[PDB]
Structure formats: C-alpha cells, structure tokens
Amino acid sequence: SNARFYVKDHRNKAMINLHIQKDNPKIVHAFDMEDLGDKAVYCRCWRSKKFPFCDGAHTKHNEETGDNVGPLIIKK
Amino acid sequence: SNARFYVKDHRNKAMINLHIQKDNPKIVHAFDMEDLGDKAVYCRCWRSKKFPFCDGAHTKHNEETGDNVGPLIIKK
Numbered sequence: 001s002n003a004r005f006y007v008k009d010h011r012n013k014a015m016i017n018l019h020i021q022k023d024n025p026k027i028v029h030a031f032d033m034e035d036l037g038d039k040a041v042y043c044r045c046w047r048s049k050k051f052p053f054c055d056g057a058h059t060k061h062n063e064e065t066g067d068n069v070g071p072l073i074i075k076k
Numbered sequence: 077s078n079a080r081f082y083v084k085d086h087r088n089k090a091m092i093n094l095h096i097q098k099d100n101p102k103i104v105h106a107f108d109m110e111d112l113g114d115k116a117v118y119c120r121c122w123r124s125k126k127f128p129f130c131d132g133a134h135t136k137h138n139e140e141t142g143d144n145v146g147p148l149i150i151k152k
C-alpha cells in the first residue's frame with residue numbers, strides 16, 4: 001500500500017448539511033406527539049427533499065460516500 | 077480573490093457518520109411513543125456520546141465546520 005494516498009485520522013472539517021435552511025444558524029425541529037400519525041420517519045442525513053422527513057435519499061448518500069446513516073422512526 | 081484556493085461546487089464525497097455502529101450497514105432507530113417520556117431530544121449530527129440522543133455535541137460540530145445542524149425533539 002502506498003501511504004502517500006491515505007488521509008490520516010483527523011478531526012472532521014466537512015459539513016453534514018449542505019443546503020437545508022442555510023439562513024438558520026442551528027436547525028431544530030420540535031413536534032408534539034399529539035400531532036403525529038401512526039408512524040413518522042425522520043431524516044438524519046440532511047439529503048431528503050422532504051426534510052425533516054425521510055424520503056429514502058440516505059440510500060444515495062450511503063452508496064456514494066460509503067456511510068451507513070439512516071432515519072429515526074417514531075410510531076404510535 | 078484567488079480562485080485557485082476554492083473547491084468548486086461538487087457532489088459530496090464526505091461521510092456524515094464517522095464512528096457510530098460501523099458494523100451496521102444502515103443505522104435506523106425506531107421508538108414507540110408509549111415508551112417516550114415528556115420530551116426526547118434526538119441527535120441528527122452523529123457526534124453525540126449518547127446517540128441516538130442529543131448531548132449538545134452539535135455545537136462543536138457547527139463551530140468547527142461552519143455547519144448549522146441540530147436535534148429533533150418529540151414532546152408529550
């Protein structure tokens with residue numbers, strides 16, 4: 001292996017969110033359980049066109065970057 | 077401005093999650109509302125020592141990377 005090709009362990013510099021609500025300095029969503037339906041599927045990858053809800057965009061992120069992120073599900 | 081210093085718009089290559097459950101190919105958490113307390117604060121930045129719960133680690137991520145991510149709150 002040629003070590004000159006490898007980026008050694010380092011403190012992350014890359015953003016997670018690239019586009020969503022970029023005039024908001026810290027994006028938080030807060031929901032009351034009363035308002036939720038039977039199931040809500042929330043995005044944790046910041047790629048969904050339906051953010052804060054998951055639309056399956058994580059599958060593209062994971063395949064493209066080698067990551068393993070997925071949504072948070074709250075069900076009733 | 078010296079344009080030679082600027083990385084032009086491009087499709088993301090960087091991972092979001094760097095360390096959590098890396099033997100899991102797609103990390104999903106699912107909770108029943110019945111089991112939730114008055115308030116649950118869920119991490120969307122993949123930096124929390126208490127993942128899937130938010131412990132405020134997002135503030136370090138945001139300051140270090142210039143990002144603007146934050147948690148998802150479900151309250152009852």
Ligand code: FES
Nearest residue numbers: 043044045054057
């Ligand atoms: S689209 Fe982001 S977690 Fe599914």
Ligand code: FES
Nearest residue numbers: 119120121130133
């Ligand atoms: S620690 Fe990740 S969103 Fe707060």
Ligand SMILES: [Cl-]
Nearest residue numbers: 058059062102
């Ligand atoms: Cl996936």
Ligand SMILES: [Cl-]
Nearest residue numbers: 026134135138
């Ligand atoms: Cl912050």
